[PDB]
Each structure stands twice: as C-alpha cells, then as structure tokens.
Design a protein around this motif. Sequence first.
Motif, short mmCIF file in Angstrom:
data_model
loop_
_atom_site.label_atom_id
_atom_site.label_comp_id
_atom_site.label_asym_id
_atom_site.label_seq_id
_atom_site.Cartn_x
_atom_site.Cartn_y
_atom_site.Cartn_z
N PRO A 47 17.13 7.22 -36.62
CA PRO A 47 16.53 8.32 -36.95
C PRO A 47 15.15 8.56 -36.43
O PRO A 47 14.47 7.87 -35.97
N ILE A 48 15.05 9.85 -36.33
CA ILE A 48 13.73 10.20 -35.66
C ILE A 48 12.46 9.97 -36.68
O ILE A 48 12.64 9.49 -37.83
N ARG A 49 11.46 9.53 -36.17
CA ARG A 49 10.34 9.03 -36.75
C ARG A 49 9.25 10.21 -36.43
O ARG A 49 8.66 10.37 -35.22
N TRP A 50 8.94 11.04 -37.54
CA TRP A 50 8.18 12.23 -37.32
C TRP A 50 6.70 11.77 -37.00
O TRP A 50 6.22 10.64 -37.61
N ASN B 9 -16.49 11.11 -54.93
CA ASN B 9 -15.21 10.50 -54.51
C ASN B 9 -15.05 10.23 -52.99
O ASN B 9 -14.17 9.79 -52.39
N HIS C 32 1.41 21.55 -45.77
CA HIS C 32 0.86 20.77 -46.83
C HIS C 32 -0.23 19.90 -46.31
O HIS C 32 0.14 18.96 -45.28
N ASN D 224 -2.92 17.15 -45.13
CA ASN D 224 -3.06 15.59 -45.36
C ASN D 224 -4.26 15.24 -44.53
O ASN D 224 -4.39 14.23 -44.19
N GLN E 5 16.03 24.42 -36.20
CA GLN E 5 16.07 22.83 -36.12
C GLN E 5 17.23 22.47 -36.53
O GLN E 5 18.00 22.83 -37.47
N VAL F 145 17.40 14.84 -34.25
CA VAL F 145 16.90 16.06 -34.71
C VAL F 145 16.38 16.77 -33.43
O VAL F 145 15.50 16.47 -32.89
N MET G 4 16.66 22.49 -41.24
CA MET G 4 17.59 21.40 -41.86
C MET G 4 17.27 21.06 -43.49
O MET G 4 18.23 21.01 -44.41
N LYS G 5 16.03 21.03 -43.94
CA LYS G 5 15.82 20.67 -45.29
C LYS G 5 16.31 22.14 -46.09
O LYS G 5 16.05 23.10 -45.35
#
Lengths: 552, 552
Positions: A160-163, A189, A286, A288, A353, A360, A437-438
């Motif tokens: 599997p691909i590792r993003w 914080n 999103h 991060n 994709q 992928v 694909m998602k």
Amino acid sequence: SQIRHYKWEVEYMFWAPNCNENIVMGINGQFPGPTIRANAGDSVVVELTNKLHTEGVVIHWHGILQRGTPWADGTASISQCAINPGETFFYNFTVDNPGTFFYHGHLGMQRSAGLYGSLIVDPPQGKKEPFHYDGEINLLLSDWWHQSIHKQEVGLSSKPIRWIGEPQTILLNGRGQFDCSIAAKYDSNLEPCKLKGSESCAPYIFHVSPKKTYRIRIASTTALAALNFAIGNHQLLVVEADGNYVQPFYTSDIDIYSGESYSVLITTDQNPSENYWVSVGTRARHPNTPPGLTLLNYLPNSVSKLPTSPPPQTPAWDDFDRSKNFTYRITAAMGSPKPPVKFNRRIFLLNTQNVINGYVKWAINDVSLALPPTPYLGAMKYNLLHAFDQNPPPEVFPEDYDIDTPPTNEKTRIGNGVYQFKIGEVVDVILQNANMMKENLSETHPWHLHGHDFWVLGYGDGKFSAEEESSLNLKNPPLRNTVVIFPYGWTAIRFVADNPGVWAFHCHIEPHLHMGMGVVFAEGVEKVGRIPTKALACGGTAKSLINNPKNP
Amino acid sequence: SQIRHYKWEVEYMFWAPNCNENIVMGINGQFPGPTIRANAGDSVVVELTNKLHTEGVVIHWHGILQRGTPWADGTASISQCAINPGETFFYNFTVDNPGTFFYHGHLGMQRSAGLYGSLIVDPPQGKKEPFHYDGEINLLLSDWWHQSIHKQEVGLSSKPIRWIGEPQTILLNGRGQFDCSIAAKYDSNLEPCKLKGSESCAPYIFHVSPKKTYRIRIASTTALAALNFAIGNHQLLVVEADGNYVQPFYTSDIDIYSGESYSVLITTDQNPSENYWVSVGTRARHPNTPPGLTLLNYLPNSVSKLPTSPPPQTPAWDDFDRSKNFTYRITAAMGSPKPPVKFNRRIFLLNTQNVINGYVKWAINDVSLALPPTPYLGAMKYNLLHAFDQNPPPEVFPEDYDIDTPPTNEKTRIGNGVYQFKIGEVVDVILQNANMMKENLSETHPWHLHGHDFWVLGYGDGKFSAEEESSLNLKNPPLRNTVVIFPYGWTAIRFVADNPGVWAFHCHIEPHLHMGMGVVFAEGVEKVGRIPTKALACGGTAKSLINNPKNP
Ligand SMILES: *[C@@H]1O[C@H](CO)[C@@H](O)[C@H](O)[C@H]1NC(C)=O
Ligand SMILES: *[C@@H]1O[C@H](CO)[C@@H](O)[C@H](O)[C@H]1NC(C)=O
Ligand SMILES: [Cu+2]
Ligand SMILES: [Cu+2]
Ligand SMILES: [Cu+2]
Ligand SMILES: [Cu+2]
Ligand SMILES: [Cu+2]
Ligand SMILES: [Cu+2]
Ligand SMILES: [Cu+2]
Ligand SMILES: [Cu+2]
Ligand SMILES: [Cu+2]
Ligand SMILES: [O-]
Ligand SMILES: [O-]
C-alpha cells in the motif's frame, strides 16, 4: 544588456530550517539558493557543477520561456539527460520580461529537499515599473517535512502507498518554527520559542519605515500546501501575477498555490508605535500545520515589541466559494496581449486518482505518465522512433464518464506518448477535475505549463459543456503559467504553440507529478538547433550518436 | 442483600493500549480494572492493597452515593488520607440502585494512568428492568497520551504551563489504534493496521445475533475528551442515564462527556449478511485524534468482512446547536421523583480560566481550589479549626462581570474554604460559564457532584437573570450526577443536602481539576459515625489524635 554569470555547486549539507537538524540540498553552501537578478533582455549563464555523490540533478527556471534554448529548461527526461556527479553543465538563456520567478529541482523529489531559490527580472535598463514603490521585500514560500525525501519517495511508490502527510513546517525564506510559536503569548496552549534571533530558524523580519510604499514579491515552491498570505491591519494591492501585470485590486489576504508568484504593494500607513503580524496559513486541505509567522517591523520599534493583536486567523480551509471569489477577480492589465479569438485545437484532460495494478497513481485521460530514460527533445530531434510511444495520446475523455463517482480503473494505463502541435497552432486545453478514489472527495490541483504563458479563459463547476462556451473571457483574460482546478470543476486555457521544443505540463504538487499527473507537449522540433552533448549523453540518444561499431 | 468481597492490589505494570508500550496502573494485573457486578441493596467490600512504591492511592466509586459511609468516597484530602505504599484499606458501601456506574483514581492525575473500570448494579434480587433486551454489551470509554502522567503533571504545574495536548488514542474497553486505522480500506491516505486479533490493542468486537435487542451500557472516564458514539445503520433508543431512567427516545448517535453513563438499546434489524461500524469520535474541541473504531459483528459473518460503508463521520466538533439539541431532550422517566418546588439556598458559580502569580489556573468565583493535607471529613469531625479556611467561600459573583471578555485576574486567589449546608436544605446551583484567557474562547465543562444525584432544572445562553425562572423544568427534570455547561452559558441544578459528609463538586476534566476547578460541599458532618483510622492518619488529624506528649 549584461551577461549575468553564476558559478554554482549543488551539494547536500546538514541544516535546520526549523531548528531541527536534517539534510538540505544547498547551492554554494546556501539554503535557500542564491538569488539570480537580471534586467529583461540580459543573458544568464549558470555553470552548475554537480557534487551530489550518486545522484543526477537538473534545475528548472520556472516561468522563463527558453525561447531558442529548450535544452536549458531543466526537466530530466524531457529537455535533457540529468547531469551526472562531478560534471559541469552550462544553462545559458535570456530573460525577456520582468517578473517574480524562481528556480527548483525537477528530478525526483529534489525540490522538497530544498533545491530552490529566487530569480527576479527587473525592467530593461532605463525603463521603469508601471507602479512606484520605495522598497522591495522578497519572499519565497515552501513547506518542510522531517521525514527523509528518499523515504517519502519509496513510500509513494509502494503497495500500500504510504502518503507523505501534511508538512511539519511552513518555511518563509527558508525559516520556520516547529513545536513552538513566536505568537505563543495569545494562547497558553502554545509553547514559547526561546530564540535570540540569531538561529537558522529565527523569522526573517520585514523591516519597513513608516509612510512608505513597499513591493512584496511572493513566490511558492511548496511541494504540497496551498497557502493564504495576510498582514494584520494592512490592505494588499495586487499588481503582478506570474511575471505579468494584472488589473490592480485590493484584498485583505491572497491565496497562493504551488507555482504561482505575485507582487503585492502595501503602504505603511498604520500606527507607527507597533509591529504587525504576517501569517501564511494552509488552505484547501484539512490543516495540520502551524502557520508560518513573521513580523512587519515598523522601524525604530524593537522587533521584540509584539503586536497588540493575535495573528490574522486563516480563512476556513474549505470555503471554496471564498477562494473562487479571489481567483475569478484576476484580469489582465489594461493594454495586455489579448487571445486569438478562434482556436485550432481544443484538448480535454480529465484528472483522476486511480489504482493501477495495486499502486495508487494519478492519470490524465486514463494515462499515468512514466517518463522514459531517453530525453524527449533529443529523441525527437534525431527521430528515434523506439524511445517512446509514437501513438497519439487521447485528446478527449468519454461523455459517459461520471465525475461524481470513484473511477472503476477498468482501462487505466501507464504511458509516455506525447501530444504534438504544429508551430503556430492556437491550442485550448480544458482541464476537468473529478471525484477521487475516496467517495465525495475532489481536491484542488495547480497545473503549470513549461515554455509558454497562456490566457485563463475561465473556470466553472461540474463538467464543461457547450453551454459554457459563451462564458469564456476573451476580452480581458490574465496571462499566467500556473492555474488551479477547483473540486469537481473545469478551467479553460488558451496559448499559441510558437516555441520549438518539448514542454512539460503537469500538476505542480510534487507527489502528484511523481505519481503520474502530467503530460508532455511537443511543437516544431524540426526547428530546434544543436543540443549540448551533455543533454544527449544518455539513453537512446547516446546509443545512436556514439559511434562504437562491432566487426567493423 | 449479599456481600460482594474483592481482594484487590494496585500496581504499575508495562502495557500497550494502542500497541505502543508504556506503563499503566493495573489492578490485579489487568488493565482496565476488573468489573464489579452486584444487585441493588448488596454491600461491596473492597480491600485494597497499595503496591505502588512511593505513591499513595485512593479509588472513587463514581455515582454511588456513600449513604452512611462518607469515609469510603475515595477522595484524597476530602474523605480520606491516601492509602500508603504497602497498606490495605477497606472500602465498604451499599450499592443502592441499579445502573451503569464505574470507578476511577481520584488522587493527582492517577486516573489518566489507567486506574479505572466498571461497577454495574443490577435490579434487586428477583425484580426485572423496566424494558426488555436479550443481551447487553459493556463499553467503557477513555483516552490515552504517550507522555508520562508525571511529566504531564509537572508540565501543568510549571510557569510557563506546558499543556498536555489532545489525546493520542481514544480507547474502547482499554484498546485503541495509533498511526494506523482498521478502516484504512476507504482511504488511501490511511495506513492499515497489521493486527491478528490477539494483540493488546486489537478492537473489542461486539458479537450479536440478528433480530435481537441489546442493552449497550456506555460510560466515560476520559481525562479530557468529549466523544460521540454512533453505530452504522442503527438507531439508538436512549433508556438510562447516570443510573436513572429517562423518558425513552431515538437518536442516530449520542454525545457523552467525561463522567456520564448511558444505556442505549438497539435491535439487529439490518441486513444479516454484513457487519457495521461502531465509531466513537471527538467533538467539542478541534479534533486531532482519530476515532475509536470497532465492529458490530452479526454472527456468523466473518469478523474480517469489512462493512460496505466507511465509519460514520463524526458531527462537526463545534456545532453546539446539535449538541444542545441532544442534551436538552433528556427528561426523567414517568414515575421518577420530582424536585422540591421551592429551594432554601441558591448559589451562583462563575467558572474562569485565570493567571495567578504567572500560573494558569482555573477558579470558581475567583478561588482556585488547592486541597489541604488534612482530610476535610476528619478535620470537620474533630473540629480542627486551623486545618482550612473557616471563612465561607463566595456564593455569588459580580453581576457587572462581562462573561465575553478575558478575566482581569485582579482579585483571583487560591483557597480551600468549604460551602456548608444544613441537613435537609434544598440547594440550587447555577453554574455560569465565561470567556477564558484567550479572546473569544469558552469551552464545555462537565461538572460532577459526589454523594448525590441532582435534577437538571435547565440550561440557557449568556448570563443567567432572575427573569429566567419560568423556563426551569420543575415537572420532568432528569436525575443525574454529571452535567455540562455549554460555551458562554449557564446550567441550573437542584439537589437536597441530605447525606452527612464532605462531597467534592468539580469539573470532571482531570487537568482542570488539577488546576483548581472545583469546590467542596459539607453537610450534616456532626452526624458522621466513626471514620476508619487509616483515613484519619495524616496531617492535622494524626497530629491531634496521636497522644505523644513531651517530658514524658
Ligand atoms: C554557455 O555559455 C558559456 C559561457 O559564455 C559558453 O562557454 C558555452 O559554450 C555556452 N554553451 C551553450 C550551449 O550556449
Ligand atoms: C469492612 O468490611 C470488612 C469485611 O466485613 C471488615 O472486616 C472491615 O473491618 C470493615 N471495615 C469498615 C471500616 O467497615
Ligand atoms: Cu515550478
Ligand atoms: Cu516551470
Ligand atoms: Cu482541523
Ligand atoms: Cu495534483
Ligand atoms: Cu515542471
Ligand atoms: Cu468520576
Ligand atoms: Cu464521583
Ligand atoms: Cu473543566
Ligand atoms: Cu470527583
Ligand atoms: O516554466
Ligand atoms: O460520585
């Protein structure tokens, strides 16, 4: 016109962009690279010695057209054979027009490792800008991962691909902060950075004097992030985009995608006893990653005099309507070159994709590009018909394809065929985005074309149709070299194939290009002159041209 | 009636809740703790041996009223001195009413270290529950960090505060996954877990037969996380909350804050050929923790057979309207006790985040609780007037306080006084939320009352005013032991001071409690019988009860 000569060595080195030590690709011991500055009409000569131990290297000059010098474009397997360790290659080209440009690695994932820097071009000597400013601030934006680029590359080529995941740091002129924030005083914080200002990751502070006007040049060579730029309490007036002048407009912040360059003007007309925040935040994904931050320091205030307000809060990452509202407002400056009104070729490129054989990959009309070991330009100049696929790639996708659902991957292939134009053709390219694909996911992709600037005729939602023809802007469209496609949308561009050579056209997000998202455009190669031997000395080109008989 | 005797030892042990080893506080060699199950009216005797080397321990039985036994509440410095290394203490109490309860550490930050487990009380021997189900499933939810509890504690006591951050893993019956997902199938960006089913972190699967109805008992002992429980393709009938019964209603998912428990019933109506996802996601705070996931496996389908759909997407963390929509529905089951119509005491408690002497503290009407070394129950029984502050704590705040602005911190202090009630007073408490130190921030806080259940009279937005009286539900208010205040709001509760003791009333989020967010209530203390000597053996109570004169 002067000849600007540079003598550079590419070598890896330990460096800490965010005060965490890693290895970076430096040029003459510098990270980021040295700035090239020239005046339009000058020749630039870069002799680059490769001092990596086992790796080839190339440098692409983003936005420079390479008119008459397509061998100098710096794209491995398209304009040249890569430069081998211990060898010296001469890139010699002319800079034709003023603008904010930059340079970067174009082999593997070398630009994510730090091979990039600025290339600025001023007006011809004696000539001046259409707008007045007192000073200039230059800013190159990029993103940084703590993981090795060689582990990232392998992870992206695995089943599997590792993003690669979101970046750890945003870098402003090569500096950023990890696990602490220079704006920690507004939120307990957050961890306060201990930084005397002398460190490698200490912010590049913009120093301005009151009541002046400043040109801020901003270029993006991010591998992944889309960023939003804003200075607290200051209006930005957009005056330049991708080395071409746009009709000026004010905005509170700008959105900048990998491959774009802008010049904005500001005026230090604010309260002179304080300093102000510069915030570069992530959008379109999103988030991060903490925002990249620095100060707009009004002299003589100490730079340790922190602003009264928090940094400007970044626009919600997924407010694509806000993003379109910025993007759609960009038009060519009064008096710019207008498009040809009729086109000779229109090509439709569906962006998907896909999963090709467990892997992928990204595909364009179901072809994931795999670049050959023979450089296309040498291969086409010496008519080497076995070096790549001679069959023409698809210029259209099926009208029964549903862009709202995942691919079936039924016919998705890897390939390396080339689109070919006749010198002088007017070409339209309709870029169609689709669901990935998602389920219920489509992303933004910045597309960049080499050796040309194109007019951005329009954008729209859903699948482009004949109903959308009348909405295309042929009066005022901007000239650009990078353009975005929004989630499930289309973007139409036009350009004239007047530049002999072989040109890449690809999504400028580095893992996407690595996974096949790009095409190759070739026009008038019959008119290409002599290519330097180093750009020919590999693959099938070295095979036919090195005379080494047997029995003779 | 029956006596349920447990022989228990607490010891730190190596364990890997999310397959990354750390040390966990285990009881009798297991993490989570052993479940207690009794029937209402029985007496539970737990003889606890402390096998920690340098630390004291206590165990609190959440939601058991300690009616007659205030010394067995398990709150260090309130009901008892902590149990010393090597010593055995007996907790003997009656479980009065059926329901889903649990127990946890209540000294320092020991519960985040893993000291917690289930306490379930079935109906009186021979009686049936008011509803039918063919089976039941017990789920205890908690959260997990990778940094040491003791490095976290020192971080929260430091100047500048080092905040603990968002949890790394959400645990469902002590197991959870980190850096991989059991639902990676639906997204190429996620890493698959290489689990066989045998591992310490492999999910506790829910096994069910088609066409049956089940009671899923859900309790939260999270240190921080507000979670949202949802089952794919299955509606939930809410039938119990905090050991009491509520008016039944249907929902697609429930919100659960630290210290609450629920029972929900489900019927396996859906298609029997497949499995369904159980997803427990973060809400009320900006998430940076993946969901806790497991399967509702319809037998005899293979547990390796993934569902056809992705996990249910957690509702947006900040959609507080949706949260209130769920919360404001809970009403008592018909047949329940109605509140006293008139109250004898009403106290107003302002919740602020403050900076006291450079330390970020939490305060209630400007006093941040710091507990004394003498247990309040011993000190008050023996009338040791120098053991704590005998001045009544503030019962109202200034009506001129702007709950939309950060605190000034002008008069905020640390203290340890007690609110004392007369045995039989009907007490009303309005808990008022406010803006924190950061501009435009107010958070949700779950408040828990020891030794009592209260009726939730209502919730409102903004500041409470006396004209708010007509909205208070004196007709059907649910009986609970934990209740939230939403951002910028108030919540009003009513209970009767009828159970002699000293009871803690605090925000159930473990860091906030560590930083002073809680109060102490004492009522009818002169009616308390004999306290265990081990519970008295420290501080002022030891000094005053150990006859040890001099010259002799
Ligand atoms: C590039 O420029 C250098 C310096 O003037 C020159 O020696 C070299 O031959 C040039 N090569 C090409 C391909 O123009
Ligand atoms: C608790 O119960 C046990 C078992 O009946 C008894 O031996 C012990 O003395 C009791 N202690 C208290 C304080 O009630
Ligand atoms: Cu580029
Ligand atoms: Cu380019
Ligand atoms: Cu987020
Ligand atoms: Cu892309
Ligand atoms: Cu390129
Ligand atoms: Cu509790
Ligand atoms: Cu409790
Ligand atoms: Cu709290
Ligand atoms: Cu408590
Ligand atoms: O370019
Ligand atoms: O409790």
